[PDB]
Design a protein around this nucleic acid. Structure first.
Ligand SMILES: [Mg+2]
Ligand SMILES: [Mg+2]
Ligand SMILES: [Mg+2]
Ligand SMILES: [Mg+2]
Ligand SMILES: [Mg+2]
Ligand SMILES: [Mg+2]
Ligand SMILES: [Mg+2]
Ligand SMILES: [Mg+2]
Ligand SMILES: [Mg+2]
Ligand SMILES: [Mg+2]
Ligand SMILES: [Mg+2]
Ligand SMILES: [Mg+2]
Ligand SMILES: [Mg+2]
Ligand SMILES: [Mg+2]
Ligand SMILES: [Mg+2]
Ligand SMILES: [Mg+2]
Ligand SMILES: [Mg+2]
Ligand SMILES: [Mg+2]
Ligand SMILES: [Mg+2]
Ligand SMILES: [Mg+2]
Ligand SMILES: [Mg+2]
Ligand SMILES: [Mg+2]
Ligand SMILES: [Mg+2]
Ligand SMILES: [Mg+2]
Ligand SMILES: [Mg+2]
Ligand SMILES: [Mg+2]
Ligand SMILES: [Mg+2]
Ligand SMILES: [Mg+2]
Ligand SMILES: [Mg+2]
Ligand SMILES: [Mg+2]
Ligand SMILES: [Mg+2]
Ligand SMILES: [Mg+2]
Lengths: 172, 197, 191, 193, 136
RNA sequence: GGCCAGCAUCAGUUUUGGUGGCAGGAUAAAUCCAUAGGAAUGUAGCUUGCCUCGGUAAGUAUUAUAGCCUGUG
RNA sequence: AGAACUGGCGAUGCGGGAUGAACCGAACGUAGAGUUAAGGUGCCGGAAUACACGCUCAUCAGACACCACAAAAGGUGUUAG
RNA sequence: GCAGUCAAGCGUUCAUAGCGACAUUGCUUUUUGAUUCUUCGAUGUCGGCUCUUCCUAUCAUACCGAAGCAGAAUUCGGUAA
RNA sequence: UUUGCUCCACACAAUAUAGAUGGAUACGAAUAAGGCGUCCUUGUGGCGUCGCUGAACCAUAGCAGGCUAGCAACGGUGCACUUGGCGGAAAGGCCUUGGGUGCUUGCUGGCGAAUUGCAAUGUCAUUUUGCGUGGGGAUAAAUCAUUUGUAUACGACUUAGA
């Protein structure tokens, strides 16, 4: 849906004389701007409580910045996604430096493997995998081995003119 | 850049060579292509064999002469890929097509001239290593091109003389690098260094 | 899911020095010398010590990794084939007509000549491949034996003969006539 | 294949020379008169062309001509043709050809008895021929208006063009044919009663 | 008869592999691979060169054949202390690669005058060298 | 002053750069420094077992002859 | 084949969908500069053989609405659950 | 009209050698219908003769795999126009 | 048929032009590997080094590049010659020898340049043709008609004719 930000979004249930100060629910929402995030907030609240944006109020909207944006983290992810023939929960694992970077390639993955456009996916939970060997998925586990190294064989250099006088070398 | 550009066909993907060759002539750049028999098509030999036979059955039912013409030579397989990328029924297109020559092997004058390469058509640069591909000379001799052996014969001879040539040349630029070494450390040399040379 | 590194060992024995530049492989042991062209397979060989070599695939897919072992194995059979050697044993079967097998020559040749198969007037001739010798085995009845350095050259010259002898137009259960591969083994003994 | 030279004999019969002219009786018969001068000087360029053949030349053919005065025919114009030499060694082929300039070759050096040979020749011509005899087409019935040696249907409605396969009245004969496997029962001699 | 198997020796993605950024705000600055995110992304730090700590796609950077001991996941200061201790810069400075980069950076700055001087000099160098080429 | 240009200073419309001063937010989040705790893809040391005279391995071992992580300031 | 509400075509060119009454975009005095729409930017052909993460190898692969068709049922092909 | 899928049954025993109910998914445009778009200031009806060319859902011929293929014969299938 | 044809030389005249404006600057082969240098045990060898783009290399100063002097070099390059050799895939071009001769910005000098007026491509390329001149060289055929019938509707074919 774009390059993502994360948003604390807080809203409540409009006041009534008989019930002033209603109950205040928060959600974290991944959106590309604050207008989507508020629409998205109201999308889920109508899926849980009896409210709709008309009868309710957004109390506050705040961006959440990654706590340690230069530290590599292993993320487990929890997703509910409609498919053509029916809806299914999932758990994937994503290794990256920010929750926002994580959510970005999640949505990219759900589109490439499962053909799921943004409207189908629900983010259920994203949380930092704390101890390793709570990493459960082999494509991440590959990258946790001690003293890891790999070559990048068959290197391809982008040419800047239509002709070359040499002959390329994929050496590296 | 240069009046004529000679392209070693060897190692290039047909549709991506044709694609750039086409645009160059339309911009007025003369081109000659050599060694079209060492040209490559993506996909295994059998696919492009069938693909050629699909092409091969199209003909004018009432007279097979007016119908589509099927040229078997690797150069002409290439010139067909090219012509489809040029509006060849305009005068402007016939113009551009005339700035083109395609050759099996490297005949005279072009043999002693230098030939260049097109990195965005280079097979080794584009295909994922592990895809299967085709060589134009194999495919053409399959569909009736008569001359693969004579070309390969002449080439391997031409290839041997050009090694004599090169050997001498690497032996002359051995001296040139030697005389260039004495000149190093002199005033001329040290000043040129500072100026980037 | 793109396996970043997976490898395989190629062990080397006392009489054998294998030499690989580009992906062309040469193996020279006691029994001879063999060469096989791996250029098509996209793998990295590494010498370690003179008795050991590794073959690896970096960032491979299934099909790519799946071709790692078959590279290891393919060089092994060059190693054993150059030390021990390869011997394929075949033994004729016929229920009436005595299949009659000789070695024949025209123009340097060396053909295997099968006569009277199921009574055929026809003469079948399988050519002897190079580096493979056929010796009819004394002491056992209706046995041919193909020996050589190259598994693939013998096992093929093996199945070449077995397939000249296929049967047509009859039930091929009830008609078992043929020449079949009865044993596959090495040349040098105790093993 | 491309021919890169033709070396000719020095002397050339009037039989072959007649073949190089449409009108002989009027002409100055100047054919090959500057070529014969190439033999004069020491042999010179005649050697270099002969030499170039040996160096190059994947193939050697020999120009021969019939002796048509030795024949009952009225036409004096001889018949010149190329005949590939199949005997060994390109350098030996031109050597043989050089040795035979102006000299004669006889049939018994080509064909022995019982040999399977092929005949290349131009069929007797009949000129313009109806579709019936020319293609072996069924005669149409007798009641048919507008004539019965024809083809009823020149084609279906579509493709709406008469087609290359359909039989049509045209020339018949005077075709080139290569007919094979003709055994030689006798090789005669002219000096033989 | 030894065995004799090739090498095919590649520069490697690894902690402490120093890497030349190509596109972006940094672009020509060296930097070191700190941690390693996956087959494509990596975590780099450039502190002496000025480049910020960041995740970066590997195809945006080229591997130098230069290496030094760095703890995986080492923070920026640590990166800086180890980088200076290893003399990375003067090592890279001394390489033909960086000398070639510096060379063409000079050629680009040449004043038209200097251009006319490079010519006059090459004329003189040519005179004595083409001479030296006939004397042996 | 007939036609046509060139440049300069302006006017209307517009396109494409360089650059200066400020306001927000977790009064960004980080790095950086201070500090408290911590673990392992366990750094030094130590033990042990083979092992071409020290290198390996599997044990201890939480800063030591690398460092990282988390909170608070 | 026959109704409902609106919008069109008919009566209407212009950009796009190669082509096309009705779709998308947008409705027309004569022109200049700029910006766009729908749709596009390998070459035909104006415009990135742009950047990024995956997926796919088809001995009849696939390739964008209206639209120029494909189903049950299967696969120890491969991918992710 | 031709072709599948499930597999209850048939086939001495035995679901699938060869078949196949109840169901059910499709393909085809030499059937017949339905429609009424083109042609009513006219596109010459049926069949045959003649001749060409194309399709394949192959009757024969080539090479094959199945069989409730001993042989002989036949049946099912594949590559095949 | 009114002194024609051809190759080389220059001249005036025309007519062109799918688009000159320092140089198309020669290994091969691999790419999960190579180029180069060096060494040897001549190898699928040892050792060194390089790439990460031709952003290079070569050329480049002088009236569009004039007129002149000198030095140091003995090098470079242009031209016409001459020695020997190679190239047939469309070779029609490449190399080598030896004299001659021009230039040399390798370095140091003398003189010239203006008024084309503050820009106006400011004309420097190569196509074909025609017309005289004189330096070499060469002195045919085809068609109509007539004729054959191995041919033919007419043309065409195939013969024959000092
Ligand atoms: Mg059978
Ligand atoms: Mg039978
Ligand atoms: Mg000649
Ligand atoms: Mg008649
Ligand atoms: Mg007849
Ligand atoms: Mg009648
Ligand atoms: Mg008829
Ligand atoms: Mg203005
Ligand atoms: Mg509408
Ligand atoms: Mg009306
Ligand atoms: Mg209207
Ligand atoms: Mg309209
Ligand atoms: Mg369409
Ligand atoms: Mg339209
Ligand atoms: Mg709409
Ligand atoms: Mg086109
Ligand atoms: Mg374009
Ligand atoms: Mg789609
Ligand atoms: Mg749709
Ligand atoms: Mg599946
Ligand atoms: Mg059964
Ligand atoms: Mg039963
Ligand atoms: Mg039963
Ligand atoms: Mg009507
Ligand atoms: Mg009408
Ligand atoms: Mg009518
Ligand atoms: Mg009609
Ligand atoms: Mg049974
Ligand atoms: Mg050597
Ligand atoms: Mg070496
Ligand atoms: Mg000279
Ligand atoms: Mg000069």
């Amino acid at each position: 849906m774009a390059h993502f930000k994360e948003y604390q979004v807080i809203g409540r249930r409009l006041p009534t004389e008989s019930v002033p100060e209603p109950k205040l629910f928060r959600m974290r929402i991944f959106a590309s701007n604050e207008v989507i995030a508020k629409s998205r907030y109201w999308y889920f609240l109508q899926k849980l409580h009896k409210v709709k944006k008309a009868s309710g109020e957004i109390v506050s909207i705040n961006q959440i910045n990654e706590a340690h944006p230069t530290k590599v983290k292993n993320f487990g992810v929890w997703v509910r996604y409609d498919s053509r023939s029916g809806t299914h929960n999932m758990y994937k694992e994503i290794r990256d430096v920010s929750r926002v970077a994580a959510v970005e390639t999640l949505y990219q993955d759900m589109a490439a493997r499962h053909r799921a456009r943004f409207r189908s996916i629900h983010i259920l939970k994203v949380a930092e995998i704390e101890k390793t060997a709570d990493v459960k998925r082999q494509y991440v586990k590959q990258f946790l081995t001690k003293d890891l190294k790999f070559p990048l064989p068959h290197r391809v250099q982008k040419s800047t003119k239509t002709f070359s006088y040499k002959r390329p070398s994929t050496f590296y | 850049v240069e009046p004529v550009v000679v392209i070693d066909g060897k190692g290039h993907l047909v549709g991506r060579l044709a694609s750039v060759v086409a645009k160059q002539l339309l911009n007025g750049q003369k081109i000659v292509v050599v060694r079209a028999e060492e040209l490559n098509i993506s996909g295994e030999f059998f696919r492009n064999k069938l693909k050629y036979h699909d092409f091969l059955r199209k003909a004018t039912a009432f007279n097979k002469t007016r119908g589509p013409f099927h040229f078997r030579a690797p150069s002409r397989i290439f010139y067909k890929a090219l012509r489809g990328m040029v509006s060849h029924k305009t005068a402007r297109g016939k113009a551009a097509l005339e700035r083109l020559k395609v050759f099996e092997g490297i005949p005279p004058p072009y043999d002693k001239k230098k030939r260049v390469v097109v990195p965005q058509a280079l097979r080794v640069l584009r295909l994922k290593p592990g895809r299967k591909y085709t060589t134009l000379g194999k495919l053409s001799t399959s569909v009736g091109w008569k001359y693969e052996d004579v070309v390969a014969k002449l080439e391997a001879k031409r290839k041997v003389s050009s090694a004599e040539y090169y050997a001498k040349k690497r032996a002359f630029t051995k001296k040139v690098a030697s005389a260039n070494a004495t000149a190093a450390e002199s005033d001329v040399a040290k000043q040129l260094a500072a100026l980037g040379y | 899911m793109k396996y970043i590194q997976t490898e395989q060992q190629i062990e080397v024995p006392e009489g054998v020095t294998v030499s690989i530049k580009s992906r062309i492989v040469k193996v020279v042991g006691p029994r001879g010398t063999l060469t096989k062209n791996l250029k098509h397979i996209d793998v990295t060989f590494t010498k370690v010590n003179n008795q050991l070599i590794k073959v690896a695939v970096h960032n491979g897919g299934r099909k790519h990794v799946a071709a790692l072992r078959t590279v290891k194995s393919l060089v092994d059979n060059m190693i054993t084939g150059v030390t021990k050697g390869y011997k394929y044993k075949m033994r004729y079967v016929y229920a009436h007509f005595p299949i009659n097998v000789n070695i024949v020559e025209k123009d340097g040749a060396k053909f295997i000549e099968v006569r009277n198969f199921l009574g055929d007037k026809k003469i079948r001739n399988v050519p002897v491949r190079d580096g493979v010798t056929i010796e009819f085995s004394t002491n056992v009845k209706d046995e041919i034996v193909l020996s050589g350095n190259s598994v693939e050259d013998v096992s093929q010259n093996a199945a070449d003969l077995q397939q000249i002898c296929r049967v047509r137009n009859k039930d091929i259960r009830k008609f078992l006539d043929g020449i079949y591969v009865s044993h596959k083994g090495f040349i040098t003994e105790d093993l | 294949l491309r021919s890169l030279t033709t070396v000719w004999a020095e002397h050339l019969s009037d039989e072959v020379k007649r073949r190089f002219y449409k009108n002989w009786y009027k002409s100055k018969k100047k054919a090959f008169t500057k070529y014969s001068a190439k033999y004069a000087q020491d042999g010179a360029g005649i050697e270099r062309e002969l030499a170039r053949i040996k160096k190059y030349a994947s193939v050697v053919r020999v120009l021969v001509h019939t002796q048509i005065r030795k024949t009952p025919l009225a036409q004096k114009k001889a018949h010149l043709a190329e005949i590939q030499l199949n005997g060994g060694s390109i350098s030996e082929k031109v050597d043989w050809a050089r040795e035979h300039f102006e000299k004669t070759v006889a049939v018994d050096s080509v064909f022995e008895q019982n040999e399977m040979i092929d005949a290349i020749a131009v069929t007797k011509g009949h000129g313009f021929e109806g579709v019936t005899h020319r293609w072996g087409t069924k005669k149409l019935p007798r009641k048919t208006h507008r004539g019965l040696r024809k083809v009823a249907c020149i084609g279906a409605w579509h493709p709406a063009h008469v087609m290359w396969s359909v039989a049509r009245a045209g020339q018949r004969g005077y075709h080139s044919r290569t007919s094979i496997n003709h055994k030689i029962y006798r090789v005669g001699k002219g000096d033989d009663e | 008869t030894d065995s004799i198997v090739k090498a095919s020796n590649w520069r490697l993605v690894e902690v402490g592999r120093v890497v030349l950024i190509k596109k972006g705000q940094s672009a020509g600055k060296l930097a070191a691979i700190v941690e390693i995110i996956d087959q494509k992304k990596v975590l780099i730090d450039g502190p002496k060169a000025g480049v910020p700590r960041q995740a970066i796609n590997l195809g945006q950077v080229v591997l130098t054949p230069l290496t030094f001991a760095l703890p995986r996941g080492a923070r920026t200061a640590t990166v800086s202390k180890k980088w200076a201790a290893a003399a990375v810069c003067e090592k890279w400075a001394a390489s033909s690669w960086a000398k070639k980069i510096a060379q063409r950076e000079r050629r680009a700055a040449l004043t038209d005058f200097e251009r006319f001087q490079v010519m006059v000099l090459r004329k003189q160098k040519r005179y004595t060298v083409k001479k030296a080429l006939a004397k042996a």
